[PDB]
Amino acid sequence: MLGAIAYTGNKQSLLPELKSHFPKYNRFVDLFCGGLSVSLNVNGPVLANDIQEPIIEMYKRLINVSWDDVLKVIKQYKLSKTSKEEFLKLREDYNKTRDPLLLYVLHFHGFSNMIRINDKGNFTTPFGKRTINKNSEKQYNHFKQNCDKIIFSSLHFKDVKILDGDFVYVDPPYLITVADYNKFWSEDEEKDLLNLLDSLNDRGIKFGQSNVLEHHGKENTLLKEWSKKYNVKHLEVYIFN
Amino acid sequence: MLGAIAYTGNKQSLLPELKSHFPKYNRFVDLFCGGLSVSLNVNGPVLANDIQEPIIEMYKRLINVSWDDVLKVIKQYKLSKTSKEEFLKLREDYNKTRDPLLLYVLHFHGFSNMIRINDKGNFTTPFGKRTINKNSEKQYNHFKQNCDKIIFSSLHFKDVKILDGDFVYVDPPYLITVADYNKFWSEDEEKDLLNLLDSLNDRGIKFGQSNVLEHHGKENTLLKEWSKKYNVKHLEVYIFN
């Protein structure tokens, strides 16, 4: 259902389907949570993880923050649909101080609500000629009313203790797809992950996996094959074991 | 809402507002209907009027015509996004035969869908390097599904029997604005109209009036004053009594 923040490639729509293919588990470990549309909406306990400390931090802070808190920032900087300088300044400040909340308030004003953090910790998204709508408070609330069951981590899937009896939903950057986070992926990672996956299968530990096998001419050769070894659903495919 | 044909200065947007300021009436008499965005969308009975026979006729014919009818013409002349000769020929034909339907099919291909009839009955708009889009069928349908309540007339507002108990929305050529039909207006007409309006006020007969009081340096001096005597809304002003 509803995620925490607009996230490119959210699972606000497929989730239901996917949920029709999930098992039992002592702990849901979302290896790639990003938006959180998946974590917030799956019986816990949940280990929300994402290799981007910035956004995880923001989540960690969002924990003890009120809507009123957010507003006080908008009014503090005089943000709005047209406030361009302000946004810059707000961005300016977040870059220097790195206060999560700032980042949070930030994105709502970024070009297409997209959080884009470069390799120096700076927020580069341009002004979105926007502000907060009504999905803003609704999304926010969901998180609040469901963040309890979640345990965040800003680890790289590589080093993430997978404690037996836990389902591991994994929606990694689609190799054959565009998106800010594809700047983190490499063919190697693809390999690693898969191995790392076969490995979880070797411990009875079941998992879920979403991806694209072929999109816009290209196709994920190596993955297309690797999938055969397991079940695949077509809705975009969910390769689960 | 949706008019019958793209018309410079349509009221597809203001209408709602304007309707928020309308009274009851036994007959809606649209003195300047042009595009029809106003007639088709106002509880009838409606007297759609415009001093341009050609476009009114087109309407009168449109009455008993089907979309399929329109297409048969397009295929008949082999019209398209690039068919320049054809357009000319089609125009060529409409000029000679003066068949409304031809004119109808015509404009969809004219430069900016603009119907421009000179003082000799000829269509002069140049080829628009276009053809029919999505809005073409949609606009068409609206008319069909709403033309019933309308009674057309190709009269000059001067001689138009205003039968008591009728609201008279009047969107005449804006004196201080450019547009093909401004070739019909003169400062005198402005005077006349206004008198003609005060006169309807003298019979309890209420009316609606849209115009621009000041636009691009210029201002409708004489009108700006005349308006004070009545109510004025700012959205462009609707001077109603």
Next chain:
DNA sequence: ACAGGATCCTGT
């Protein structure tokens, strides 16, 4: 400056 498509947004 406008159309008309694209997408956004909101309530439901």
Next chain:
DNA sequence: ACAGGATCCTGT
């Protein structure tokens, strides 16, 4: 999750 109305965008 949708409808479709309200906005954003962009080729003329």
